[PDB]
Amino acid sequence: LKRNVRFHAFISYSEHDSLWVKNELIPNLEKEDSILICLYESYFDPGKSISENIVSFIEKSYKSIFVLSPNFVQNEWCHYEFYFAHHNHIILILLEPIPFYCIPTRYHKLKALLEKKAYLEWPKDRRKCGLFWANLRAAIN
């Protein structure tokens, strides 16, 4: 049972995937147009440690959405390893395919989620985007 929840959703992403996050994902979440979104750019508090911020992001949010891509894995994931090495609610989107061979060996839980395909794949085919968003809303509620 979660404590001091201040946000419906935390969105974790590479700034290189900004345009999708801010032009596609957030507009679709603000379809309860009252929804409170935690984003690093607006709530990282340098008065706390990096890890304490990341813990607050996930634990003060009903859901955490991770926008997975080669950029996220190569540049951002390293700051979440301390969390997920000991923790198992969490929504994974595969925005862009990740070749298994570029994923660092130590990212065990990541590589296993990818293997069993526990994620929502963003379709590059635009007629399939409806199904995507439908699956996302079923996942969050």
Add this chain to the structure above:
Amino acid sequence: RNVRFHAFISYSEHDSLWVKNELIPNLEKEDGSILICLYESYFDPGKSISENIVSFIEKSYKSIFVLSPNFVQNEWCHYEFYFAHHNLFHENSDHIILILLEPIPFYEKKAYLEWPKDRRKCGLFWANLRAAIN
């Protein structure tokens, strides 16, 4: 050659008392206006965590890492990407200064500045530290 700071200091907040009452004052004691980059003051969430760290390091003449069990257990995971990237496990970099504030039991080999157990060698430690940053 395009630096903004003399020294960036990376440290665990559990070691902040030593940082703010010993480290910083002694660097300031023989250099009143020394320019110091702290994460708490210069973090820019307009940039990524790694991009912030990279900027702290590149913009500082020297980078001082305050190593301790507290640092290793809480902070090292966010800085390893820099060290792993610049191969600083097999090779040295002249702008990085490591301070072993408190021993790390194994449960870089030997190029650090050890904080002395004997209070009488604190003068010497600060002499060594000023040599490293100037």
